[PDB]
Protein backbone atom coordinates (compact mmCIF):
# COMPACT_ATOMS: atom_id res chain seq x y z
CA UNK A 1 0.00 0.00 0.00
CA UNK A 2 1.17 3.48 -0.91
CA UNK A 3 -1.02 6.55 -0.35
CA UNK A 4 -1.72 8.85 -3.28
CA UNK A 5 -4.47 11.29 -4.17
CA UNK A 6 -7.40 9.45 -5.69
CA UNK A 7 -7.38 9.98 -9.45
CA UNK A 8 -10.36 9.67 -11.79
CA UNK A 9 -9.71 8.69 -15.38
CA UNK A 10 -12.61 8.55 -17.81
CA UNK A 11 -13.29 6.51 -20.95
CA UNK A 12 -16.06 6.38 -23.57
CA UNK A 13 -16.90 3.04 -25.09
CA UNK A 14 -19.44 3.09 -27.89
CA UNK A 15 -19.84 6.57 -29.27
CA UNK A 16 -22.52 7.85 -31.61
CA UNK A 17 -23.33 11.24 -33.12
CA UNK A 18 -27.09 11.71 -33.22
CA UNK A 19 -27.95 14.32 -35.86
CA UNK A 20 -31.57 13.77 -34.93
CA UNK A 21 -32.22 15.26 -31.43
CA UNK A 22 -28.93 17.30 -31.78
CA UNK A 23 -26.65 15.30 -29.51
CA UNK A 24 -23.71 12.95 -29.13
CA UNK A 25 -24.61 9.76 -27.29
CA UNK A 26 -22.34 7.13 -25.79
CA UNK A 27 -21.64 5.00 -22.73
CA UNK A 28 -18.96 6.31 -20.38
CA UNK A 29 -16.95 4.20 -17.95
CA UNK A 30 -15.09 5.81 -15.06
CA UNK A 31 -12.11 4.09 -13.44
CA UNK A 32 -11.48 5.32 -9.90
CA UNK A 33 -8.93 3.23 -7.99
CA UNK A 34 -8.11 4.29 -4.41
CA UNK A 35 -11.35 6.36 -4.33
CA UNK A 36 -13.59 6.44 -1.27
CA UNK A 37 -17.24 5.87 -2.07
CA UNK A 38 -18.78 6.47 -5.48
CA UNK A 39 -17.74 9.26 -7.82
CA UNK A 40 -20.43 11.97 -8.02
CA UNK A 41 -22.15 12.56 -11.34
CA UNK A 42 -21.27 16.26 -11.11
CA UNK A 43 -17.55 15.49 -10.99
CA UNK A 44 -17.81 13.17 -13.99
CA UNK A 45 -19.64 15.94 -15.85
CA UNK A 46 -16.74 18.40 -15.77
CA UNK A 47 -14.10 15.80 -16.65
CA UNK A 48 -16.12 14.59 -19.61
CA UNK A 49 -16.50 18.24 -20.57
CA UNK A 50 -12.74 18.72 -20.92
CA UNK A 51 -12.18 15.51 -22.87
CA UNK A 52 -14.62 16.55 -25.62
CA UNK A 53 -13.93 20.32 -25.34
CA UNK A 54 -17.52 21.38 -24.86
CA UNK A 55 -17.98 25.15 -24.39
CA UNK A 56 -20.32 24.86 -21.40
CA UNK A 57 -19.83 22.07 -18.88
CA UNK A 58 -23.53 21.92 -17.98
CA UNK A 59 -24.68 20.76 -21.42
CA UNK A 60 -23.41 17.26 -20.59
CA UNK A 61 -26.05 14.75 -19.49
CA UNK A 62 -24.99 11.74 -17.43
CA UNK A 63 -27.56 9.28 -16.18
CA UNK A 64 -27.63 5.95 -14.45
CA UNK A 65 -24.30 4.46 -13.43
CA UNK A 66 -23.66 0.92 -12.23
CA UNK A 67 -20.61 0.45 -10.05
CA UNK A 68 -18.77 -2.77 -10.81
CA UNK A 69 -18.57 -5.45 -8.12
CA UNK A 70 -15.25 -5.38 -6.34
CA UNK A 71 -15.05 -1.65 -6.78
CA UNK A 72 -12.62 0.24 -8.90
CA UNK A 73 -14.96 1.42 -11.64
CA UNK A 74 -18.43 2.53 -12.72
CA UNK A 75 -20.14 2.60 -16.13
CA UNK A 76 -23.12 4.68 -17.23
CA UNK A 77 -24.62 6.39 -20.25
CA UNK A 78 -23.62 9.84 -21.47
CA UNK A 79 -25.18 12.59 -23.57
CA UNK A 80 -23.61 15.82 -24.85
CA UNK A 81 -25.73 18.17 -26.91
CA UNK A 82 -24.70 20.77 -29.45
CA UNK A 83 -26.44 23.55 -27.52
CA UNK A 84 -27.55 24.11 -23.95
CA UNK A 85 -30.83 25.42 -25.34
CA UNK A 86 -31.11 22.07 -27.11
CA UNK A 87 -30.57 20.36 -23.75
CA UNK A 88 -33.56 22.07 -22.15
CA UNK A 89 -35.62 21.07 -25.19
CA UNK A 90 -34.93 17.35 -25.59
CA UNK A 91 -34.14 16.10 -22.12
CA UNK A 92 -36.89 14.67 -19.90
CA UNK A 93 -38.00 16.61 -16.88
CA UNK A 94 -36.47 14.20 -14.39
CA UNK A 95 -32.97 14.56 -15.78
CA UNK A 96 -33.43 18.31 -15.89
CA UNK A 97 -34.54 18.35 -12.24
CA UNK A 98 -31.41 16.40 -11.29
CA UNK A 99 -29.41 19.22 -12.94
CA UNK A 100 -31.16 21.97 -11.00
CA UNK A 101 -33.03 23.69 -13.84
CA UNK A 102 -36.41 22.06 -14.37
CA UNK A 103 -40.11 22.38 -13.78
CA UNK A 104 -41.27 22.10 -10.18
CA UNK A 105 -43.34 19.04 -9.42
CA UNK A 106 -47.09 19.08 -10.11
CA UNK A 107 -49.62 18.57 -7.30
CA UNK A 108 -50.01 14.97 -6.18
CA UNK A 109 -51.98 13.03 -8.71
CA UNK A 110 -54.49 11.72 -6.17
CA UNK A 111 -55.67 15.31 -5.70
CA UNK A 112 -56.13 16.10 -9.40
CA UNK A 113 -58.01 12.83 -9.82
CA UNK A 114 -60.54 13.74 -7.12
CA UNK A 115 -61.10 17.28 -8.38
CA UNK A 116 -61.69 16.04 -11.92
CA UNK A 117 -64.32 13.60 -10.63
CA UNK A 118 -66.05 16.47 -8.84
CA UNK A 119 -66.16 18.49 -12.06
CA UNK A 120 -67.89 15.65 -13.93
CA UNK A 121 -71.15 16.64 -12.23
CA UNK A 122 -70.94 20.34 -13.10
CA UNK A 123 -71.54 22.13 -16.40
CA UNK A 124 -71.12 25.91 -16.29
CA UNK A 125 -68.19 28.21 -15.76
CA UNK A 126 -67.94 26.98 -12.16
CA UNK A 127 -65.52 24.19 -13.06
Amino acid sequence: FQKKKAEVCIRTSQFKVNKLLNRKQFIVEVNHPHWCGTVPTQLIRKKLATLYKVPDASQVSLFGFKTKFGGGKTTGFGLIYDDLASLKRFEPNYRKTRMGFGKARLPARKSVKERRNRNKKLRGKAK
Binding site: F1, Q2, G70, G71, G72
Partner: protein, 182 residues
Protein backbone atom coordinates in the same frame (compact mmCIF):
# COMPACT_ATOMS: atom_id res chain seq x y z
CA UNK B 1 -47.94 -11.78 -12.48
CA UNK B 2 -46.80 -11.04 -16.01
CA UNK B 3 -43.16 -11.74 -15.24
CA UNK B 4 -41.33 -14.20 -17.47
CA UNK B 5 -37.99 -14.46 -15.70
CA UNK B 6 -37.04 -18.13 -15.46
CA UNK B 7 -35.68 -20.25 -12.61
CA UNK B 8 -34.93 -23.94 -12.11
CA UNK B 9 -33.36 -26.21 -9.50
CA UNK B 10 -29.66 -26.99 -9.50
CA UNK B 11 -29.44 -29.92 -7.06
CA UNK B 12 -31.43 -33.01 -6.21
CA UNK B 13 -31.70 -34.98 -3.03
CA UNK B 14 -30.73 -38.65 -3.30
CA UNK B 15 -33.05 -41.55 -3.09
CA UNK B 16 -32.39 -43.59 0.08
CA UNK B 17 -31.42 -40.87 2.57
CA UNK B 18 -29.55 -43.26 4.92
CA UNK B 19 -26.98 -45.27 3.01
CA UNK B 20 -23.96 -45.92 5.17
CA UNK B 21 -21.66 -46.18 2.16
CA UNK B 22 -22.90 -42.89 0.67
CA UNK B 23 -22.89 -40.95 3.95
CA UNK B 24 -19.24 -41.89 4.53
CA UNK B 25 -18.08 -40.76 1.09
CA UNK B 26 -19.81 -37.41 1.36
CA UNK B 27 -18.33 -36.63 4.77
CA UNK B 28 -14.93 -37.21 3.18
CA UNK B 29 -15.92 -34.81 0.41
CA UNK B 30 -17.05 -32.19 2.92
CA UNK B 31 -13.72 -32.51 4.71
CA UNK B 32 -11.30 -32.74 1.81
CA UNK B 33 -12.85 -29.75 0.03
CA UNK B 34 -14.12 -27.60 2.91
CA UNK B 35 -17.81 -27.68 2.09
CA UNK B 36 -20.67 -26.16 4.05
CA UNK B 37 -23.38 -28.76 3.51
CA UNK B 38 -24.23 -31.88 1.56
CA UNK B 39 -26.23 -29.76 -0.92
CA UNK B 40 -23.03 -28.30 -2.40
CA UNK B 41 -22.01 -31.88 -3.23
CA UNK B 42 -25.46 -32.56 -4.67
CA UNK B 43 -25.30 -29.83 -7.27
CA UNK B 44 -21.92 -31.17 -8.36
CA UNK B 45 -23.75 -34.49 -8.76
CA UNK B 46 -26.38 -32.86 -10.98
CA UNK B 47 -23.80 -30.81 -12.90
CA UNK B 48 -21.85 -33.94 -13.70
CA UNK B 49 -24.98 -36.07 -14.17
CA UNK B 50 -26.18 -33.78 -16.95
CA UNK B 51 -22.77 -33.99 -18.65
CA UNK B 52 -22.74 -37.75 -18.25
CA UNK B 53 -26.25 -37.98 -19.77
CA UNK B 54 -25.76 -35.78 -22.83
CA UNK B 55 -22.44 -37.40 -23.67
CA UNK B 56 -24.13 -40.78 -23.41
CA UNK B 57 -26.84 -39.64 -25.83
CA UNK B 58 -24.27 -38.49 -28.38
CA UNK B 59 -22.62 -41.92 -28.45
CA UNK B 60 -25.96 -43.42 -29.47
CA UNK B 61 -25.70 -41.02 -32.40
CA UNK B 62 -23.21 -42.11 -35.07
CA UNK B 63 -20.15 -40.16 -36.02
CA UNK B 64 -20.61 -37.68 -38.92
CA UNK B 65 -24.06 -36.87 -37.54
CA UNK B 66 -24.96 -33.17 -37.11
CA UNK B 67 -25.82 -33.35 -33.40
CA UNK B 68 -22.58 -35.15 -32.54
CA UNK B 69 -20.07 -32.93 -34.40
CA UNK B 70 -21.75 -29.81 -33.14
CA UNK B 71 -22.61 -30.05 -29.42
CA UNK B 72 -20.19 -32.94 -28.89
CA UNK B 73 -17.39 -30.55 -29.64
CA UNK B 74 -19.09 -28.19 -27.19
CA UNK B 75 -19.03 -30.59 -24.26
CA UNK B 76 -15.41 -31.45 -24.94
CA UNK B 77 -14.73 -27.74 -25.16
CA UNK B 78 -16.13 -26.90 -21.73
CA UNK B 79 -14.25 -29.78 -20.12
CA UNK B 80 -11.00 -28.49 -21.58
CA UNK B 81 -11.90 -24.90 -20.71
CA UNK B 82 -12.73 -25.49 -17.04
CA UNK B 83 -10.07 -28.09 -16.35
CA UNK B 84 -12.40 -31.06 -16.21
CA UNK B 85 -10.32 -32.93 -18.81
CA UNK B 86 -6.71 -32.42 -19.82
CA UNK B 87 -6.01 -31.82 -23.49
CA UNK B 88 -5.10 -35.43 -24.31
CA UNK B 89 -8.66 -36.50 -23.44
CA UNK B 90 -10.53 -35.69 -26.64
CA UNK B 91 -12.56 -38.78 -27.54
CA UNK B 92 -15.82 -37.86 -25.61
CA UNK B 93 -15.68 -41.16 -23.72
CA UNK B 94 -13.81 -39.39 -20.92
CA UNK B 95 -16.82 -37.30 -19.90
CA UNK B 96 -18.43 -40.61 -18.92
CA UNK B 97 -15.47 -41.19 -16.58
CA UNK B 98 -15.60 -37.86 -14.74
CA UNK B 99 -16.07 -38.01 -10.99
CA UNK B 100 -17.34 -35.59 -8.36
CA UNK B 101 -13.79 -34.88 -7.03
CA UNK B 102 -12.82 -34.02 -10.62
CA UNK B 103 -15.27 -31.10 -10.51
CA UNK B 104 -14.55 -30.10 -6.90
CA UNK B 105 -10.88 -29.55 -7.74
CA UNK B 106 -11.90 -26.69 -10.02
CA UNK B 107 -13.59 -24.58 -7.37
CA UNK B 108 -11.92 -21.34 -6.33
CA UNK B 109 -11.82 -22.71 -2.78
CA UNK B 110 -9.57 -25.51 -4.02
CA UNK B 111 -7.20 -23.61 -6.35
CA UNK B 112 -6.51 -20.94 -3.70
CA UNK B 113 -5.51 -23.87 -1.51
CA UNK B 114 -3.57 -25.55 -4.34
CA UNK B 115 -1.88 -22.44 -5.74
CA UNK B 116 -0.54 -21.69 -2.27
CA UNK B 117 -2.37 -18.52 -1.26
CA UNK B 118 -3.79 -20.14 1.90
CA UNK B 119 -2.65 -22.65 4.51
CA UNK B 120 -5.77 -24.84 4.58
CA UNK B 121 -8.88 -25.35 2.51
CA UNK B 122 -10.83 -23.64 5.31
CA UNK B 123 -8.38 -20.75 5.08
CA UNK B 124 -9.20 -20.44 1.39
CA UNK B 125 -12.98 -20.27 1.86
CA UNK B 126 -12.60 -17.48 4.40
CA UNK B 127 -10.32 -15.41 2.16
CA UNK B 128 -12.62 -15.73 -0.84
CA UNK B 129 -15.72 -14.74 1.11
CA UNK B 130 -13.83 -11.94 2.88
CA UNK B 131 -12.93 -10.31 -0.45
CA UNK B 132 -9.23 -11.11 -0.83
CA UNK B 133 -8.91 -13.09 -4.09
CA UNK B 134 -9.18 -11.50 -7.52
CA UNK B 135 -9.31 -13.79 -10.53
CA UNK B 136 -8.55 -11.27 -13.30
CA UNK B 137 -8.39 -8.13 -11.15
CA UNK B 138 -12.00 -9.04 -10.35
CA UNK B 139 -12.76 -9.65 -6.67
CA UNK B 140 -14.59 -12.98 -6.59
CA UNK B 141 -16.45 -13.67 -3.36
CA UNK B 142 -17.98 -16.97 -4.45
CA UNK B 143 -16.37 -20.21 -3.25
CA UNK B 144 -18.20 -22.33 -5.85
CA UNK B 145 -16.63 -20.27 -8.63
CA UNK B 146 -15.37 -22.85 -11.13
CA UNK B 147 -11.97 -21.59 -12.27
CA UNK B 148 -11.15 -21.97 -15.96
CA UNK B 149 -7.75 -23.14 -17.18
CA UNK B 150 -6.79 -19.69 -18.47
CA UNK B 151 -7.82 -18.10 -15.17
CA UNK B 152 -5.27 -20.09 -13.12
CA UNK B 153 -2.40 -17.83 -14.16
CA UNK B 154 -4.05 -14.70 -12.78
CA UNK B 155 -5.41 -15.70 -9.37
CA UNK B 156 -3.74 -13.47 -6.79
CA UNK B 157 -4.66 -11.28 -3.88
CA UNK B 158 -7.08 -8.46 -4.58
CA UNK B 159 -5.65 -5.04 -5.29
CA UNK B 160 -8.03 -3.52 -2.72
CA UNK B 161 -7.36 -6.16 -0.07
CA UNK B 162 -5.11 -5.41 2.92
CA UNK B 163 -3.08 -8.49 1.97
CA UNK B 164 -2.49 -7.03 -1.48
CA UNK B 165 -1.96 -3.32 -2.12
CA UNK B 166 -4.99 -1.94 -0.27
CA UNK B 167 -5.59 -0.19 3.02
CA UNK B 168 -5.00 -2.09 6.29
CA UNK B 169 -7.92 -4.09 7.64
CA UNK B 170 -10.03 -3.71 10.73
CA UNK B 171 -7.88 -4.85 13.66
CA UNK B 172 -5.00 -2.60 12.62
CA UNK B 173 -7.33 0.28 11.79
CA UNK B 174 -9.39 0.25 14.98
CA UNK B 175 -6.10 -0.01 16.88
CA UNK B 176 -4.75 2.92 14.86
CA UNK B 177 -7.74 4.94 16.07
CA UNK B 178 -7.17 4.00 19.72
CA UNK B 179 -3.56 5.16 19.50
CA UNK B 180 -4.81 8.43 17.99
CA UNK B 181 -7.03 9.69 20.83
CA UNK B 182 -4.08 9.54 23.25
Amino acid sequence: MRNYNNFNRVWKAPRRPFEKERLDREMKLCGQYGLRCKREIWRVNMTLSKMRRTARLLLTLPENHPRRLLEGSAIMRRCHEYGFLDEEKDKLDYVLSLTVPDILERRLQTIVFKAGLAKSVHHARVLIQQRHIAVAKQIVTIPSFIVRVSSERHIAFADASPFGNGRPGRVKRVRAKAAKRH
